[PDB]
Amino acid sequence: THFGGLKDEDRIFTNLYGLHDPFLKGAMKRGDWHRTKDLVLKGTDWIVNEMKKSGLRGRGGAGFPSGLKWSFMPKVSDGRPSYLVVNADESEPGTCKDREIMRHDPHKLLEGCLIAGVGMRASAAYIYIRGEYVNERLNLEKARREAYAAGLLGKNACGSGYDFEVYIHFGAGAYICGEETALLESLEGKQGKPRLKPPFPANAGLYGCPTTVTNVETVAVSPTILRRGPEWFSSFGRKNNAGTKLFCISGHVNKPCTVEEEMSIPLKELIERHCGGVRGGWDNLLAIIPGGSSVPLIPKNICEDVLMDFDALKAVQSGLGTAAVIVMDKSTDVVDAIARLSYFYKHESCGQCTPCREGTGWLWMIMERMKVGNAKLEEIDMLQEVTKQIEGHTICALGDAAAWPVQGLIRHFRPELERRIRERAEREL
Amino acid sequence: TEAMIRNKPGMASVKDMPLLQDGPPPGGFAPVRYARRISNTGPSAMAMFLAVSGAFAWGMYQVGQGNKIRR
Ligand SMILES: Cc1cc2nc3c(=O)[nH]c(=O)nc-3n(C[C@H](O)[C@H](O)[C@H](O)COP(=O)(O)O)c2cc1C
Numbered sequence: 001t002h003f004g005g006l007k008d009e010d011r012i013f014t015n016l017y018g019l020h021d022p023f024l025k026g027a028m029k030r031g032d033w034h035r036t037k038d039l040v041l042k043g044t045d046w047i048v049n050e051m052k053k054s055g056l057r058g059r060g061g062a063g064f065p066s067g068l069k070w071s072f073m074p075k076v077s078d079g080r081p082s083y084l085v086v087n088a089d090e091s092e093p094g095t096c097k098d099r100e101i102m103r104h105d106p107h108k109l110l111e112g113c114l115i116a117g118v119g120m121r122a123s124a125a126y127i128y129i130r131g132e133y134v135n136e137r138l139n140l141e142k143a144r145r146e147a148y149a150a151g152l153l154g155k156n157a158c159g160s161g162y163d164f165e166v167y168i169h170f171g172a173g174a175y176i177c178g179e180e181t182a183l184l185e186s187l188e189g190k191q192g193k194p195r196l197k198p199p200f201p202a203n204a205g206l207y208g209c210p211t212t213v214t215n216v217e218t219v220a221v222s223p224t225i226l227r228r229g230p231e232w233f234s235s236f237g238r239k240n241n242a243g244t245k246l247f248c249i250s251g252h253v254n255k256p257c258t259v260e261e262e263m264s265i266p267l268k269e270l271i272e273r274h275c276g277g278v279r280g281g282w283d284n285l286l287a288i289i290p291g292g293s294s295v296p297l298i299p300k301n302i303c304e305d306v307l308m309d310f311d312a313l314k315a316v317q318s319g320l321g322t323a324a325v326i327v328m329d330k331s332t333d334v335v336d337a338i339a340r341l342s343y344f345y346k347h348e349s350c351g352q353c354t355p356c357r358e359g360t361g362w363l364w365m366i367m368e369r370m371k372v373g374n375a376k377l378e379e380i381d382m383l384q385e386v387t388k389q390i391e392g393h394t395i396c397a398l399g400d401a402a403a404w405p406v407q408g409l410i411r412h413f414r415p416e417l418e419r420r421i422r423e424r425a426e427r428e429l
Numbered sequence: 430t431e432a433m434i435r436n437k438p439g440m441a442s443v444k445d446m447p448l449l450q451d452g453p454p455p456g457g458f459a460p461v462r463y464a465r466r467i468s469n470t471g472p473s474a475m476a477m478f479l480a481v482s483g484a485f486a487w488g489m490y491q492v493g494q495g496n497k498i499r500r
């Protein structure tokens with residue numbers, strides 16, 4: 001078909017821009033907490049089944065099919081109280097879609113905590129707010145106190161027979177702590193250092209108890225996915241990728257904004273319609289980082305007709321992460337921008353594993369050389385090889401997230417890197 | 430390393446490294462002789478016998494004349 005058009009009655013995250021009251025008496029008017037008693041009474045298997053049928057995929061960088069992820073949790077509880085850590089923490093460069101759910105309609109996030117908790121047989125939800133979101137977690141603790149006073153959460157899930165309580169943890173400025181296997185530890189009290197995957201969080205995660213880490217957007221669309229139609233949700237986007245992603249058009253657009261819109265939308269259509277347009281017209285575009293910062297670039301010659309869905313952006317030698325589209329026009333120093341991205345991945349890399357801990361400082365040094373031109377024309381093949389040495393070997397996908405920006409920069413703008421290097425050469429002598 | 434040991438300011442690339450080491454000059458060295466050039470330009474078989482025999486004929490005539498003078 002032809003995607004992109006989402007009508008104001010189809011946007012799931014109403015009160016995104018905080019125009020209306022976020023808390024109760026303002027959330028019940030937006031349908032929040034509408035009839036969750038019935039949903040909880042409809043059971044856990046029905047919730048998982050409707051989430052799988054709705055084809056909701058991971059709103060976070062992983063892109064995993066939710067629901068199927070929620071079916072990983074154990075059915076019969078063997079004494080370990082299954083938890084539900086909500087990955088409120090983002091810290092991905094470009095990504096504010098979580099910041100508009102923690103505040104500005106947080107009750108959708110709390111009701112999603114509850115509905116996913118009954119969905120995955122959980123017993124408590126730890127909304128891991130990003131550390132810097134102080135005002136956001138204050139709004140969320142206000143809404144949590146409300147949903148506790150209104151009998152929604154705690155010792156009876158919205159009057160139902162489900163004991164489910166939402167506790168609000170908050171980290172402290174660490175993009176690495178945001179990872180699924182590192183959220184469990186940074187919340188366990190230890191450092192935010194990921195654990196290896198052979199113990200999966202669904203098998204032994206938080207406190208060793210089973211758990212599933214869900215981004216706020218996936219857990220927060222869960223309520224309206226169930227209350228509305230799972231067929232209605234899956235009616236958006238392409239076949240596999242389906243839903244209404246919450247985008248964040250980040251930089252070098254004349255009107256930067258985060259706006260919810262149907263997935264599989266043409267990136268050019270999103271840019272030209274909602275956020276205005278690439279500063280100086282579309283012909284001024286240089287590159288676009290379509291996902292968060294954990295995704296390769298798009299050099300504007302494959303950015304005209306690319307759709308903002310997981311599958312197509314993966315097929316374009318890139319990825320749709322948090323869909324925090326970062327736009328860069330012909331006026332920016334794209335090598336300097338990717339150098340600052342690699343500096344970010346050097347800073348926010350908990351250093352647990354050698355391929356990332358060291359090679360990311362290495363990528364930052366090579367990028368801060370190539371952005372001046374101090375390198376040699378064969379280093380652009382070392383940089384590719386260094387990134388491919390980091391990629392598959394790191395404990396978590398941060399190694400990926402640090403090798404992918406530089407890999408995409410090389411793959412696409414190798415002419416510009418080579419030009420800077422040759423210009424440095426001719427500047428000498 | 431090995432691009433920070435052989436600098437050659439500029440060079441834009443890992444090739445074109447200085448690479449100045451010992452070797453023959455452009456065009457090689459001169460053609461060096463190895464054969465045995467032993468010049469046989471001496472007195473021949475004759476001219477050596479005829480120098481000797483000329484002496485043991487005139488010089489012996491002189492010995493004779495000296496014997497005549499001494500006698
Ligand atoms: C490199 C990397 C970056 C991540 N970035 C985010 C992020 O920005 N936001 C988030 O909620 N989770 C993030 N995560 C955690 C997971 O990838 C995933 O987003 C989360 O555990 C579940 O989200 P989902 O249920 O929507 O797939 C990140 C993990 C890795 C390895």
Ligand code: SF4
Nearest residue numbers: 351352353356394396
């Ligand atoms: S070194 Fe990189 S991959 Fe390893 S735990 Fe730290 S951030 Fe994750």
